[PDB]
Write an enzyme that holds these catalytic residues in place. Structure first.
Site, short mmCIF file in Angstrom:
data_model
loop_
_atom_site.label_atom_id
_atom_site.label_comp_id
_atom_site.label_asym_id
_atom_site.label_seq_id
_atom_site.Cartn_x
_atom_site.Cartn_y
_atom_site.Cartn_z
N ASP A 200 0.90 -1.23 0.08
CA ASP A 200 -0.19 0.00 0.11
C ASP A 200 0.91 1.35 0.02
O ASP A 200 0.55 2.44 0.38
CB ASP A 200 -1.05 0.04 1.10
CG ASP A 200 -2.09 -1.24 0.97
OD1 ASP A 200 -2.09 -1.92 0.01
OD2 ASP A 200 -2.70 -1.28 2.00
N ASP A 226 -0.18 -4.62 -3.75
CA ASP A 226 -0.94 -3.29 -4.04
C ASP A 226 -0.22 -2.13 -3.89
O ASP A 226 -0.76 -1.07 -3.13
CB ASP A 226 -2.11 -3.52 -3.11
CG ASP A 226 -2.89 -4.62 -3.22
OD1 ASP A 226 -2.87 -5.49 -4.22
OD2 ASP A 226 -3.89 -5.18 -2.34
#
Length: 366
Positions: A200, A226
């Protein structure tokens, strides 16, 4: 392979389709100003001893004229919060290279609110313009969560971030999320920067605006899972995306868009490089992307046209041999299986399939 219409596991845009996806097209009428760090209105190291203090000065002074905050070369263990304001801000590192100015913390989503207060609380007085952001994180219980893990948090339009490095260095377990940069507003420009993390790293477009545009140029972004995620209209031109192997070396994923199904323009990666540690070269166990199916409980709960359906085009970019070359797109966060539409005639906005596409890429991973 880069032949259109591609395969069900790796769809490729036709030449004709490609003309609908360009910088101009993703910009949707926005004409980004030239970045021109031509002055210093507020200088951290020559007027301000925290970055927040310089941000606060610029915001509090108001006006419509773009203000320039120079951060002297150094390592800064702090957050930087830009609350909503009509003051246009450019925040730039004063060094020769963006690596010379580093804003860094080890602050995962799993951080307790007490620890968050200890770490950043001294940056905030109750009278200060970003106090509500700090307090909303400070007031959580148990963990601060993904949004509050953010090291540099932009909630104002028209911000320029230039020549500096932002890092959230949390790699404490394989399950931790930790945001380096988060953008929540329209017309954000990130130029000549380095964005460092693992899971992230870059929350690109965290807000609800139908039009929430960001433009990344000459920027280096690293992570493993991600590490570019969210729902903005985000353009990445001449950027480098680097899949790290130092936290983990089993199964990486670069992009995780949760683009609204009614939004045509999600993520556009153009004239960029997608690469990583050598381990992935021999592994081929990285994926280019998966859908962040935000708010979708399971594959059973996915509603085509209502649920998010992440949109991503990688065009005229270099993809190194670190990815699964037959199947670079993996299962959505919801469990919704990846489905590529390789019909010769098709709607690229159809929500019964994913919206991950490529055009005219090269390199060993193309």
């Amino acid at each position: 392979d880069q032949t259109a219409p591609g395969t069900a596991s790796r769809p490729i845009l036709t030449a004709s389709e490609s003309n609908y996806f360009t910088t101009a097209t993703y910009l949707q009428g926005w004409s980004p100003p030239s970045i021109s760090t031509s002055k210093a209105d507020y200088t951290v190291g020559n007027g301000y001893n925290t970055i927040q203090a310089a941000v606060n000065a610029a915001i509090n002074a108001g006006g419509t004229t773009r203000k320039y905050i120079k951060i002297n070369a150094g390592t800064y263990q702090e957050v930087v919060y830009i609350p909503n304001t009509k003051v246009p801000l450019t925040i730039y590192g004063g060094g020769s290279s963006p690596s010379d100015t580093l804003i860094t913390l080890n602050m995962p989503a799993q951080t307790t609110p007490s620890a968050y207060k200890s770490l950043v609380g001294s940056l905030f007085n109750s009278a200060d313009p970003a106090y509500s952001m700090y307090n909303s994180c400070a007031s959580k219980s148990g963990t601060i969560g993904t949004s509050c893990s953010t090291v540099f948090w932009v909630k104002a339009p028209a911000v320029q971030i230039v020549n500096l490095s932002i890092e959230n260095s949390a790699k404490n377990t394989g399950d931790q999320q930790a945001v380096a940069l988060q953008t929540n507003s329209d017309q954000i420009q990130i130029h000549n920067a380095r964005l460092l993390g693992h899971q992230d790293t870059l929350y690109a477009g965290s807000g609800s605006s139908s039009v929430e545009r960001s433009y990344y140029t000459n920027t280096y972004i690293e992570g493993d899972i991600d590490f570019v995620f969210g729902g903005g209209s985000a353009i990445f031109e001449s950027c480098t995306f680097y899949v790290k192997a130092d936290r983990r070396s089993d199964t990486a994923v670069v992009f995780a868009p949760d683009t609204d199904p009614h939004k045509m323009y999600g993520y556009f990666v153009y004239k960029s490089t997608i690469t990583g540690d050598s381990a992935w070269s021999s592994s081929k166990k990285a994926y280019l992307g998966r859908a962040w199916d935000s708010g979708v409980s399971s594959s059973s709960a996915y509603v085509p046209g209502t649920s998010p359906n992440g949109q991503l085009i990688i065009k005229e970019s270099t993809i190194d041999g670190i990815i699964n070359t037959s199947g670079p797109w993996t299962t959505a966060t919801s469990g919704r299986t990846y489905s590529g539409n390789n019909a010769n005639s098709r709607d690229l906005n159809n929500d019964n399939y994913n919206r991950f596409w490529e055009y005219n890429n090269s390199g060993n991973g193309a």
